[PDB]
Amino acid sequence: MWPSARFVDDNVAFSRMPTERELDEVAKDFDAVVVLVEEYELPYSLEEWKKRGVEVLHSPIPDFTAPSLEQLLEILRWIEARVREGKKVLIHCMGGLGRSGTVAVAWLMYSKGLPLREALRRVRSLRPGAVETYEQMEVLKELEKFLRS
Ligand code: VO4
Numbered sequence: 001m002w003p004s005a006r007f008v009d010d011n012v013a014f015s016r017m018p019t020e021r022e023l024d025e026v027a028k029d030f031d032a033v034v035v036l037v038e039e040y041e042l043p044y045s046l047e048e049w050k051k052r053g054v055e056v057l058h059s060p061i062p063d064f065t066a067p068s069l070e071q072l073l074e075i076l077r078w079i080e081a082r083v084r085e086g087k088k089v090l091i092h093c094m095g096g097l098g099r100s101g102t103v104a105v106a107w108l109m110y111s112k113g114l115p116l117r118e119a120l121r122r123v124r125s126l127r128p129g130a131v132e133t134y135e136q137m138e139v140l141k142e143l144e145k146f147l148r149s
Contacts, residue, residue: 006126011083014091014100027052031087066135076110101130
């Protein structure tokens with residue numbers, strides 16, 4: 001089991017970026033991956049996942065930035081479709097955990113219906129670094145507004 005990952009539920013985990021020598025480790029444990037980092041900051045081609053039979057969502061988010069709400073909902077519908085199929089899903093950015101922590105928090109709100117204050121508490125209990133910037137928090141507040149309506 002790849003110990004840098006942290007699970008927010010049975011099926012969805014978030015982590016820093018796996019390096020090349022960790023790809024098999026992660027392919028063993030995860031069937032799908034959400035890559036939040038721009039192609040240019042990758043030390044390998046995302047075809048490394050395809051050759052291992054891992055499904056990839058590449059939805060880049062700039063460093064220290066938040067996704068739009070539209071981008072965040074697309075990501076959540078995709079994770080949901082993967083978990084539906086019985087796959088386990090790893091979310092990662094670089095090292096910061098701002099972006100990945102944001103998506104982790106959102107997954108709890110989207111899938112389990114947690115209020116933002118509790119989902120944020122859970123994720124930050126896992127990684128004190130999760131959700132680093134005010135725009136990240138704000139897009140989560142926007143998501144909550146969206147779901148309650
Ligand atoms: O660029 V971050 O994913 O540490 O907000």
